[PDB]
Amino acid sequence: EEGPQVKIREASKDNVDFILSNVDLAMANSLRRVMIAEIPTLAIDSVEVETNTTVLADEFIAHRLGLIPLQSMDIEQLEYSRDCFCEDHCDKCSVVLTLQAFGESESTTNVYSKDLVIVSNLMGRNIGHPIIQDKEGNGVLICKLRKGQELKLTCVAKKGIAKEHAKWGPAAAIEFEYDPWNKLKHTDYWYEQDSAKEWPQSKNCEYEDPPNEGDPFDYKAQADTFYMNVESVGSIPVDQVVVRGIDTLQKKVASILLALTQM
């Protein structure tokens, strides 16, 4: 087609395995960094506690509520409250979640991310839905109550990035490898007898030609072709972790061009 090229190896709701050729390592990495840190997500940010009869602390629970993944598909049409014009929050900038739970049962009563209810007007946008990947359809286990154990609270979810808090991290681990045969001599293999026998062969070795000993060292050789795997948490779909990552980095660069323009 044009410049750098992609070749997807495997896909799911949760994973994207692909090959990125005709790219600078610096670019591959900068994208990898952005996916981890700069993609916006919606996550619980304020927790007003009306009642808590639980064995857990108000803030212990509060902390967990932030780590619960929320639907951030249409996150782009929500404003950062900081940029919003209200007094604290509103609809244009937040999602209000409610959680009322009580131990009616003699048996232990469980509190799940499913038990969260949206109270704010969604403006008909795909946002704030607790992500349920759970087979039984419960989502994240927030708490356990016994008998008169009541938990009544209110959550304000806000747009944010992983730089502010890791709760707004839409990506789990991002796998990243290049040159499975150390052709580039980018690592000096620690060994005891044989580095080839001692160090396990990469999966990606199959997608590259072995060096063949009867050849001189390619110094001219440079790093292109990157075997990556992007894992999603739920907030954004796997593809959009890649796309939005590409786009964020693009926007980030545009700001610099624009800054120079104003100067």
Of 123, 166, 196, 205, the one binding another protein by CB under 8 A: 166
Known binding residue 84? Answer is yes
* Exposure b/e, 47-58, CB count within 10 A at least 16 = b: beeeebebebee
Regarding 155 and contact with another protein (CB under 8 A), the answer is no
Q: 239 touches which of Zn ion, another protein, none (CB within 5 to 8 A by kind)?
A: another protein
In one-letter notation, the amino acid at residue 143 is: C
**86 annotated as belonging to a binding site for a ligand:** yes
71-100 positions binding Zn ion, by CB under 5 A: 84, 86, 90, 92-93
Rounded-to-integer distance, Cα 95 and Cα 110, Å: 24
Query: Of the candidates 124, 206, 215, 263, which one interacts with another protein according to CB under 8 A?
Result: 263
Residues 114 and 130 sit within 8 Å (Cβ to Cβ): yes
Contacts of 161 (CB under 8 A, 6+ apart): 37, 38, 39, 40, 41, 168
Interacting residues with another protein between 81 and 140 (CB under 8 A): 82, 108, 113, 131-136, 138-140
Q: Contacting another protein (CB under 8 A), which of 34, 44, 99, 155?
A: 34
Residue ranges of E strands in 4-58? 5-6, 10-11, 15-21, 41-52
Binding-site positions read: 84, 86, 90, 93
Binding-site positions for Zn(2+) read: 84, 86, 90, 93
